[PDB]
Amino acid sequence: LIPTVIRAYDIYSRLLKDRIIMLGSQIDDNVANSIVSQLLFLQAQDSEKDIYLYINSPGGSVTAGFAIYDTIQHIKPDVQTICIGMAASMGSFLLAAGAKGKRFALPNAEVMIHQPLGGAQGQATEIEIAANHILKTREKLNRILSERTGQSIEKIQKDTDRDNFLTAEEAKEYGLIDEVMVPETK
Amino acid sequence: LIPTVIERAYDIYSRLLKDRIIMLGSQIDDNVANSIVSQLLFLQAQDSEKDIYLYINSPGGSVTAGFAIYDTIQHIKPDVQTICIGMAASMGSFLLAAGAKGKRFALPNAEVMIHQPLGGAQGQATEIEIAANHILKTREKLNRILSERTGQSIEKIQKDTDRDNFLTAEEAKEYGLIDEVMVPET
Amino acid sequence: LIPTVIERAYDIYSRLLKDRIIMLGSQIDDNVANSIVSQLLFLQAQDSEKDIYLYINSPGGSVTAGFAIYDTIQHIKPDVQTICIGMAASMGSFLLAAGAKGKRFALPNAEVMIHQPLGGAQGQATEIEIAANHILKTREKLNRILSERTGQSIEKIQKDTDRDNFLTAEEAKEYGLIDEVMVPETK
Amino acid sequence: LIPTVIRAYDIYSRLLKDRIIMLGSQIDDNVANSIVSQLLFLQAQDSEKDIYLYINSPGGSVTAGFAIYDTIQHIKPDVQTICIGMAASMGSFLLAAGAKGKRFALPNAEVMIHQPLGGAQGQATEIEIAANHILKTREKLNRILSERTGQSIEKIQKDTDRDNFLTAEEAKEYGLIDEVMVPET
Amino acid sequence: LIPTVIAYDIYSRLLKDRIIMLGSQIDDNVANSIVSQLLFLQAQDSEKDIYLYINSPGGSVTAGFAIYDTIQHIKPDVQTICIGMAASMGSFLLAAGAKGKRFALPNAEVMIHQPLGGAQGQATEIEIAANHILKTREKLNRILSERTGQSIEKIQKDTDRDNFLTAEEAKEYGLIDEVMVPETK
Amino acid sequence: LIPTVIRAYDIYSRLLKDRIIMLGSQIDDNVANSIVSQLLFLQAQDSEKDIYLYINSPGGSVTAGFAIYDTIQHIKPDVQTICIGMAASMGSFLLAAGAKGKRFALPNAEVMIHQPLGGAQGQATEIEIAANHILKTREKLNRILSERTGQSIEKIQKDTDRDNFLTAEEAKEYGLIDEVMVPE
Amino acid sequence: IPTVIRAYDIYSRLLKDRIIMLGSQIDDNVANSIVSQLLFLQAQDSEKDIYLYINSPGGSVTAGFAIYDTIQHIKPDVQTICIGMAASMGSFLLAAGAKGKRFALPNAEVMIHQPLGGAQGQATEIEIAANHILKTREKLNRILSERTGQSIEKIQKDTDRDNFLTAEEAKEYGLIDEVMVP
Amino acid sequence: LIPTVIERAYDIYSRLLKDRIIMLGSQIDDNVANSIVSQLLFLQAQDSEKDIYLYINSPGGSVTAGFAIYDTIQHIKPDVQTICIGMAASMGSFLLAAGAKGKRFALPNAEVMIHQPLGGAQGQATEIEIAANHILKTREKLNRILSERTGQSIEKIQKDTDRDNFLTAEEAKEYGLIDEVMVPETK
Amino acid sequence: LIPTVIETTNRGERAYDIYSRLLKDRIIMLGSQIDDNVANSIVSQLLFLQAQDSEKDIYLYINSPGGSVTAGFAIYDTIQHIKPDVQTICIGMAASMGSFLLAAGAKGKRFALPNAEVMIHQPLGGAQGQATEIEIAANHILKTREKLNRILSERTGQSIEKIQKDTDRDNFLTAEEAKEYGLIDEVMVP
Numbered sequence A: 001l002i003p004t005v006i007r008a009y010d011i012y013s014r015l016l017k018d019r020i021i022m023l024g025s026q027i028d029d030n031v032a033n034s035i036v037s038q039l040l041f042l043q044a045q046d047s048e049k050d051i052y053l054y055i056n057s058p059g060g061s062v063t064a065g066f067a068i069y070d071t072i073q074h075i076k077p078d079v080q081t082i083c084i085g086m087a088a089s090m091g092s093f094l095l096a097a098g099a100k101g102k103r104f105a106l107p108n109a110e111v112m113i114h115q116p117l118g119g120a121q122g123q124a125t126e127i128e129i130a131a132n133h134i135l136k137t138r139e140k141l142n143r144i145l146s147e148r149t150g151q152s153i154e155k156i157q158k159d160t161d162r163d164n165f166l167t168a169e170e171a172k173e174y175g176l177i178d179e180v181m182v183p184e185t186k
Numbered sequence B: 001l002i003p004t005v006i007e008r009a010y011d012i013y014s015r016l017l018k019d020r021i022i023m024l025g026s027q028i029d030d031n032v033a034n035s036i037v038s039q040l041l042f043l044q045a046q047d048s049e050k051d052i053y054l055y056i057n058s059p060g061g062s063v064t065a066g067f068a069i070y071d072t073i074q075h076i077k078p079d080v081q082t083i084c085i086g087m088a089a090s091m092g093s094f095l096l097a098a099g100a101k102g103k104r105f106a107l108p109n110a111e112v113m114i115h116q117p118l119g120g121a122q123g124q125a126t127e128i129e130i131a132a133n134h135i136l137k138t139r140e141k142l143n144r145i146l147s148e149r150t151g152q153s154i155e156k157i158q159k160d161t162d163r164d165n166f167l168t169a170e171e172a173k174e175y176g177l178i179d180e181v182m183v184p185e186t
Numbered sequence C, H: 001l002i003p004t005v006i007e008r009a010y011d012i013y014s015r016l017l018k019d020r021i022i023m024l025g026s027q028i029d030d031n032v033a034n035s036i037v038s039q040l041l042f043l044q045a046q047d048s049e050k051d052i053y054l055y056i057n058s059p060g061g062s063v064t065a066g067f068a069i070y071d072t073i074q075h076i077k078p079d080v081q082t083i084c085i086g087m088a089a090s091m092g093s094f095l096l097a098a099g100a101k102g103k104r105f106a107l108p109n110a111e112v113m114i115h116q117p118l119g120g121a122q123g124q125a126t127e128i129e130i131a132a133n134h135i136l137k138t139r140e141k142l143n144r145i146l147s148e149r150t151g152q153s154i155e156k157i158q159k160d161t162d163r164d165n166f167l168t169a170e171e172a173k174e175y176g177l178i179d180e181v182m183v184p185e186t187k
Numbered sequence D: 001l002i003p004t005v006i007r008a009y010d011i012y013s014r015l016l017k018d019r020i021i022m023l024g025s026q027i028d029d030n031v032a033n034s035i036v037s038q039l040l041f042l043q044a045q046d047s048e049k050d051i052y053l054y055i056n057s058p059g060g061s062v063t064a065g066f067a068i069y070d071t072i073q074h075i076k077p078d079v080q081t082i083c084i085g086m087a088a089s090m091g092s093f094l095l096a097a098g099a100k101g102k103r104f105a106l107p108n109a110e111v112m113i114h115q116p117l118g119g120a121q122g123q124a125t126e127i128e129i130a131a132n133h134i135l136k137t138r139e140k141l142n143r144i145l146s147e148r149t150g151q152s153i154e155k156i157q158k159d160t161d162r163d164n165f166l167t168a169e170e171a172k173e174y175g176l177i178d179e180v181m182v183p184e185t
Numbered sequence E: 001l002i003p004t005v006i007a008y009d010i011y012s013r014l015l016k017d018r019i020i021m022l023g024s025q026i027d028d029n030v031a032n033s034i035v036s037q038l039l040f041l042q043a044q045d046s047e048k049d050i051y052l053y054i055n056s057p058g059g060s061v062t063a064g065f066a067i068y069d070t071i072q073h074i075k076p077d078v079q080t081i082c083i084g085m086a087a088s089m090g091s092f093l094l095a096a097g098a099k100g101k102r103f104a105l106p107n108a109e110v111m112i113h114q115p116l117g118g119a120q121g122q123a124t125e126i127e128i129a130a131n132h133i134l135k136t137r138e139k140l141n142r143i144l145s146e147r148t149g150q151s152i153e154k155i156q157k158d159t160d161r162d163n164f165l166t167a168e169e170a171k172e173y174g175l176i177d178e179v180m181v182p183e184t185k
Numbered sequence F: 001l002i003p004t005v006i007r008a009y010d011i012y013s014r015l016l017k018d019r020i021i022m023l024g025s026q027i028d029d030n031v032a033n034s035i036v037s038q039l040l041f042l043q044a045q046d047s048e049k050d051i052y053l054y055i056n057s058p059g060g061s062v063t064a065g066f067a068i069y070d071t072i073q074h075i076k077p078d079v080q081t082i083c084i085g086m087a088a089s090m091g092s093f094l095l096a097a098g099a100k101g102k103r104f105a106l107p108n109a110e111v112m113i114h115q116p117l118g119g120a121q122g123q124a125t126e127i128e129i130a131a132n133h134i135l136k137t138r139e140k141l142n143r144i145l146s147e148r149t150g151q152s153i154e155k156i157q158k159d160t161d162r163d164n165f166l167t168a169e170e171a172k173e174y175g176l177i178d179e180v181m182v183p184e
Numbered sequence G: 001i002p003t004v005i006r007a008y009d010i011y012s013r014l015l016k017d018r019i020i021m022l023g024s025q026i027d028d029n030v031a032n033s034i035v036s037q038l039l040f041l042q043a044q045d046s047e048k049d050i051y052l053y054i055n056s057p058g059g060s061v062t063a064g065f066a067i068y069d070t071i072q073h074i075k076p077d078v079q080t081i082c083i084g085m086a087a088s089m090g091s092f093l094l095a096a097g098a099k100g101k102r103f104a105l106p107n108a109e110v111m112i113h114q115p116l117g118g119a120q121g122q123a124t125e126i127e128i129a130a131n132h133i134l135k136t137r138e139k140l141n142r143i144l145s146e147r148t149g150q151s152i153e154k155i156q157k158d159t160d161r162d163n164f165l166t167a168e169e170a171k172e173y174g175l176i177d178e179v180m181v182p
Numbered sequence I: 001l002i003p004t005v006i007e008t009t010n011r012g013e014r015a016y017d018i019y020s021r022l023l024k025d026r027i028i029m030l031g032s033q034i035d036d037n038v039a040n041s042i043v044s045q046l047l048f049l050q051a052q053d054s055e056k057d058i059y060l061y062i063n064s065p066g067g068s069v070t071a072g073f074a075i076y077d078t079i080q081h082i083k084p085d086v087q088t089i090c091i092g093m094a095a096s097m098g099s100f101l102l103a104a105g106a107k108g109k110r111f112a113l114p115n116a117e118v119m120i121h122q123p124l125g126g127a128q129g130q131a132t133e134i135e136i137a138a139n140h141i142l143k144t145r146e147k148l149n150r151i152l153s154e155r156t157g158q159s160i161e162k163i164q165k166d167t168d169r170d171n172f173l174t175a176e177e178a179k180e181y182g183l184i185d186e187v188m189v190p
């Protein structure tokens, strides 16, 4: 049950009013379509002011993740990315896809990078097509990470061969984020 | 949970429909086709001249449902722009190609896939024959229209759709399924 | 799932009903038939002169639910237009063929299918006989009305419905199931 | 529990000693392999004496049936066919396949003929291949039935379009069997 | 069915007075809602205390840290009040409240244990998962050490298995500052 | 379908306006959280006026029950308890937890007391911990019942060993309630 | 399964006259049995022909290759006789019989296609499985070319999808030598 | 149905055991290991000098069950030949490599596969650590023995077993898992 | 499918299933999870072998993940009761009650092959119902553990308190480690 805040907003709709979008679950097409539409709407409201993408996600669909990636790059406003809780797989990809100098993580947040997961069954030719497709998809993802992080493509491939868990501070020095957002007031 | 925007209160997809943006964001069944057909007809009645924008993030689905969307696009006066974000596969890519000439787009990292239609039949040989003839006719009809829409020959469409054929956004433009790859201008 | 329209706030399908368009967009069960019957009666009461438009994207379903729609169409004063978009199969195509003469339409890539009715029976020989005779009378009743609506003879309908018979929008017109293929004029 | 008779035999193996093979179930590969083995065994014991194929079966696999059919035709001994209870689909095809003048049914035995059953899922090209395969298989069945019964291929195709039940007498005059084996007073 | 007051649902009414309800197993949905609420209450009033009700058996560690980090990031003191139970990540969040303002009511139950997880597949994948959960445990223990005043190794021994504590025992442990006494009538 | 009464209220929210809280189901964390919130709301609405806790419950979670218990004792207003239908296990504990002199049952209401239920699976040391935990919980429940009823702990222990059903009148003489509320 | 009279079950009686029955889907259990039978028949008599009955929809590739290698290893000629059907690895094994001694009965069905498989998990795991089944296909197609006389590129085209053949069509393709007429 | 052979009525696998052939033709579990251990012990007692022949067509399975077989092979006096027919995967290929040196074979089209051991663990971080340390020790143990049996270095074994690694019979020979590919006589 | 072995005699052919042939030479196979069926069979086998010869050694083969404690104690007590020495040999694995029974073999005749795995841990159980029912089950399994630990201490030479710490969680041991622990006497080398 999502609480209401007083016009009357559900808490997530209230956050959208101050240009905060919530990527808070597994990335499927429904989540992507919603985050795309929110990005488009916020552009139309104001092309100058920053948008804030909250990321607490284990990842999910690559294609759905790319719907969000492209929409972030297409629109005029800077899209800040803030990892809170965890950003894994396509979650961590989108965290690195934020506007330069405005990608953050909170101190105890967990960033994880790995290679894409998929499947194929049937004839040897069908297996070959699926294998060729997912290998092209991985290289596409590794290319963009290399550009976004400033690590070489070969380093990205080695480090994503298996699940690679990084602390907030480790994700900064890797180049996935720009800053560990510390508690100033405390 | 779909967020709400206030600018009167709209759910996000209804706010997009106010600016003539329809969302084809899931598998194509009869329910999705009927919702889209109704949105198309409604937007015509509001304004028969202004452009409609059909967002496509879909893996295809039912062929007859897809054709309900196709025929309703062609019937109405407004240009329906097609925009592949995320992925457009099978009947999704067909409906991408059915967009108004000069206004079929795909974002850079969007995935396009074409293949032949999928079906099934069980029972007596006479029933298998009838179902086999039906799905072959259905493929000829799809290949006919894809040839007319892309500029490729029917024989090339049939070879290239014999098994799953993945295409980048740029490869989709070279093939004639889209007109432009919508680059990040800003 | 369903988008809202502000033109008072309507869900999209309700906005279409305001312009006398009814959506038969699913498998025909009793819930669907009751809704459509209630819509037909409402539109009559608003205006007995103006046309009603029955959008048909349906694979068929319950025969009796189909006849609930059929009888309510024939009972009311207004002409009810039928427009096949996507597909109209089994009782879907029967209802497509039940539209007011000269106002049964299909868009060019719509699919039409006709067959005999489907049913079942399990138990004693006497119960199987009763169920068999019932479904046979139902088929004759369906074929008699299809003959009258299309102009084809009862024996031609019985051969052409013996198995699944797929027809294009154009083939549906020349069979007599529709009157006109609604071609795109602006293109 | 199959009873034993006395050298001790289970009852079916006792029947096999007198050259009687029991086709008493759905025709799958295991049943076909056993009957094929039995036919080859009985040939080796005596290439001349008749073999008696009891048929109480609803049919089953077409390829498994043709394993039985071809093995019947290949071997030297005449293979009598006896429909008791029922012979349906490939069961009735095998009933018709017996040695000429030696295909029998008992008076209340049921004979049914229909077209083959199958299935296909996936791409339109895969569906096309399965359709063409099963249609060829039906033509193959109807051609052999035509030769065996004396009826035309076109009549067999009309009479097998839907389930078609026949009495013993009706199956005789159709040409599926030669005689109705009546009980003596 | 949640009751309404005049029109707020009861939980939304509590949120109007800066009370947030952590009353279920901690998953990502619950974490995102609480994070959103914490950020909203900061924006309304950056000075005034927030009150975090905890009746939770724990759940996801990463979801718990989403809540933990947001509490530490915002300016307002976040009071924590254990009512019913605070277990696992629940008790971690109870200890994470503003110093001097972590409470439990007299019959509330506080439980602490080590995190739970899983791994299946190759030895190398099991190794990676094992090193990951051990690092997560050390991170949890380091922060609990800081919050309670107890040593990291005392936390490790005391969380090796389920360790149930009364409200009073939790206070002397350093998980809470006070056992909340009844209001003055 | 819960009926509405007319400002429009669903029937339970209407009862909440007049300081009546419904504990009408199994006690889990959700029920407890709702009731806790209602008790805190009614305190803020008026610190003086009585609150009425309707109890028709088979019990449930002990920790969820203690969330309701502690919140009752915390707040300023007297909380009346009224058992209608049944109060079993933690249900009867909460019945007994009402303000002194204002714990009621209607004449055919069923009151049942028993010991807590739980479980454990795994290693002997895990079983021991789970066993020690549930025994301390029983000692905690029995100590508070002793105080609330006037019965000795050892009498509570014997009487809760197995399921012990009590009539409304029997509940009064035991000390779980103060009065059987007769027809007016 | 009936008995004949010492007492034999019918399949064991056929093994006494050097006949092996491949009458089911090819899994490891069927392959271990047939390999053991082949070895036993070699030891009894290294010169006399062995007769492999084939009524099989195919099955595991590796299990099929257990039977294939053992046929090629032993001294006796193994005749292959397709009765009912020989599909996929069943047809591969049919083509593997001694040269001039591969048969099918008139109405027997022979089918050839490419091997089936599957893979799930990481892209690197999918790549390995893809490369493995592609190698397995080249190996199967290579041997069929040698056994039939057809080119590797013709075998790859004809096995791209399910391809059904009559007994007569199997002869002129080179999968068998003779149609055994009654 | 396993066929019977008469000379004394043996089932076909028992007939093979008479001539000192043991069949490892399935997934390795405790039952299979116990049976193979017992056969090895029995064959030793019959004749401590003559070779034993271990047929391997197996996808592998339990590591401890596999080591039951490994140790019993090494314990007994007779040489235990190994012959891969069809496939030897994981612990299957380990046991293939464990045959008497100079007497480890594969037929030309036999698939040999080497990877790292598989396992799992659910529960507390401490319980996950114990299960992780156990399987890592087990992999080191397997890799050390493979090194001694093949002549390859431990670090090369480590890299080549990190993922599923399929080898042909010939590739298994040059890797050192087998000594000979048993080619057929011409034609 | 358990293979059968046929040996020629002067008066025909004698057929044994392989495990029954091992029993002829006083070898008993503990090759599975220890349930009551496994225990009863092993108990009966021990009793039979005693009656055949009260002086000759019996050989207990152990490849077992453990199982029922009471079933294990059926085997344990029967071993101790009979006169013949019962050698124990771990091949593959001996875990939990498996390793306990390994440790229970005749002093000096407990073995393991070099790559055999030996694991010790505390007993497993469960309880559901009333607090008092939980108490009884808890007290019962705790007494069972004390009983297991006390006998292991006598058999290994390790103190009760070290056994308790070493069995608190799953403790995997190599064959050599099991020797030095006192669970076995010798690693039987090739």
Ligand SMILES: [N-]=[N+]=NCCC[C@H]1C(=O)N(Cc2cccc3ccccc23)C[C@@H]2N(C(=O)NCCCC(F)(F)F)CCC(=O)N21
Pocket: A036, A037, A040, A041, A042, A044, A071, A074, B015, B016, B017, B019, B021, B053, B054, B055, B083, B085, B182, B183, B184, B185
């Ligand atoms: N180079 N260049 N660029 C700018 C051309 C954008 C173009 C277009 O292609 N689309 C298609 C589209 C659909 C869905 C999601 C998308 C995400 C990323 C990009 C495109 C998307 C919609 C957009 N409109 C708009 O924003 N209207 C304002 C209303 C937005 C609302 F408030 F409804 F959200 C309507 C007017 C128009 O011409 N366009």
Ligand SMILES: [N-]=[N+]=NCCC[C@H]1C(=O)N(Cc2cccc3ccccc23)C[C@@H]2N(C(=O)NCCCC(F)(F)F)CCC(=O)N21
Pocket: B037, B038, B041, B042, B043, B045, B046, B072, B075, B076, B077, C015, C016, C017, C019, C021, C053, C054, C055, C083, C085
């Ligand atoms: N170009 N051209 N033309 C020819 C006019 C079309 C004609 C008709 O055939 N239909 C049937 C129909 C139903 C459903 C979906 C369809 C999709 C494609 C084609 C037809 C469809 C409805 C339409 N009306 C309308 O749009 N009224 C405006 C309201 C629209 C709303 F806002 F409700 F959506 C009512 C008046 C009328 O005569 N028609």
Ligand SMILES: [N-]=[N+]=NCCC[C@H]1C(=O)N(Cc2cccc3ccccc23)C[C@@H]2N(C(=O)NCCCC(F)(F)F)CCC(=O)N21
Pocket: C037, C038, C041, C042, C043, C045, C046, C072, C075
């Ligand atoms: N002989 N004769 N014939 C023509 C008068 C019809 C007659 C009748 O038989 N019914 C029964 C009926 C119920 C439900 C669905 C039906 C569908 C098809 C036919 C009948 C139906 C109701 C109708 N009314 C009405 O339409 N009122 C207008 C309001 C309609 C609304 F707007 F509510 F939908 C009330 C007054 C009345 O006498 N009748």
Ligand SMILES: [N-]=[N+]=NCCC[C@H]1C(=O)N(Cc2cccc3ccccc23)C[C@@H]2N(C(=O)NCCCC(F)(F)F)CCC(=O)N21
Pocket: D036, D037, D040, D041, D042, D044, D045, D071, D074, D075, D076, G013, G014, G015, G016, G017, G019, G051, G052, G053, G081, G083
């Ligand atoms: N006409 N004619 N033809 C007989 C010559 C045929 C030839 C052959 O092709 N086969 C293969 C075969 C296998 C299985 C089932 C089959 C069914 C139909 C046809 C062939 C079959 C076996 C047969 N043998 C035999 O029958 N031996 C007698 C013993 C039989 C037993 F008693 F074991 F069953 C061994 C000697 C031999 O050269 N052949």
Ligand SMILES: [N-]=[N+]=NCCC[C@H]1C(=O)N(Cc2cccc3ccccc23)C[C@@H]2N(C(=O)NCCCC(F)(F)F)CCC(=O)N21
Pocket: A014, A015, A016, A018, A020, A052, A053, A054, A082, A084, A184, A185, E035, E036, E039, E040, E041, E043, E044, E070, E073, E074, E075
């Ligand atoms: N001290 N300090 N520092 C740093 C300034 C915070 C900064 C920011 O980093 N975010 C990202 C963010 C998103 C979601 C959850 C988060 C939880 C914890 C931290 C960050 C979070 C959003 C925030 N905004 C805001 O609060 N606007 C007021 C409305 C809040 C609402 F009412 F909607 F909740 C918009 C303006 C802005 O610059 N920021």
Ligand SMILES: [N-]=[N+]=NCCC[C@H]1C(=O)N(Cc2cccc3ccccc23)C[C@@H]2N(C(=O)NCCCC(F)(F)F)CCC(=O)N21
Pocket: E013, E014, E015, E017, E019, E051, E052, E053, E081, E083, F036, F037, F040, F041, F042, F044, F071, F074
């Ligand atoms: N004011 N005061 N006082 C009395 C001081 C109590 C103190 C506190 O400890 N909490 C924590 C708390 C949370 C949830 C359930 C609890 C149940 C029992 C005890 C504590 C609870 C919240 C409370 N607030 C309040 O009641 N505000 C009134 C509105 C209540 C509403 F109507 F929203 F329910 C906010 C102001 C405040 O300092 N407190």
Ligand SMILES: [N-]=[N+]=NCCC[C@H]1C(=O)N(Cc2cccc3ccccc23)C[C@@H]2N(C(=O)NCCCC(F)(F)F)CCC(=O)N21
Pocket: G035, G036, G039, G040, G041, G043, G070, G073, G074, G075, H015, H016, H017, H019, H021, H053, H054, H055, H083, H085
């Ligand atoms: N030419 N050539 N060939 C074969 C002699 C090779 C050699 C060998 O490599 N094996 C291993 C082996 C096991 C299982 C299946 C196999 C299949 C194909 C090849 C090998 C196989 C066993 C064989 N023996 C034998 O056949 N003894 C006869 C009895 C056979 C029985 F009747 F038991 F089956 C024991 C004596 C011996 O040195 N060998």
Ligand SMILES: [N-]=[N+]=NCCC[C@H]1C(=O)N(Cc2cccc3ccccc23)C[C@@H]2N(C(=O)NCCCC(F)(F)F)CCC(=O)N21
Pocket: H037, H038, H041, H042, H043, H045, H072, H075, I021, I022, I023, I025, I027, I059, I060, I061, I089, I091
């Ligand atoms: N030097 N040295 N070393 C070691 C002496 C071996 C010793 C022993 O330790 N065992 C235990 C044992 C059980 C099960 C499987 C084992 C596998 C590998 C090693 C041991 C095994 C049994 C063996 N016996 C025997 O083989 N008898 C021959 C008949 C065997 C039969 F035919 F029954 F299988 C009985 C006489 C005897 O003293 N031993």
Ligand SMILES: [N-]=[N+]=NCCC[C@H]1C(=O)N(Cc2cccc3ccccc23)C[C@@H]2N(C(=O)NCCCC(F)(F)F)CCC(=O)N21
Pocket: I043, I044, I047, I048, I049, I051, I052, I078, I081, I082, I083
């Ligand atoms: N030391 N010690 N001694 C053995 C004398 C003990 C005594 C007894 O208490 N039992 C009960 C018993 C039952 C089952 C399992 C047991 C396991 C452990 C102890 C006892 C068991 C049976 C035994 N008998 C016997 O062994 N007869 C020999 C035949 C054995 C066979 F071959 F059948 F297995 C019959 C004669 C007799 O007085 N006894």
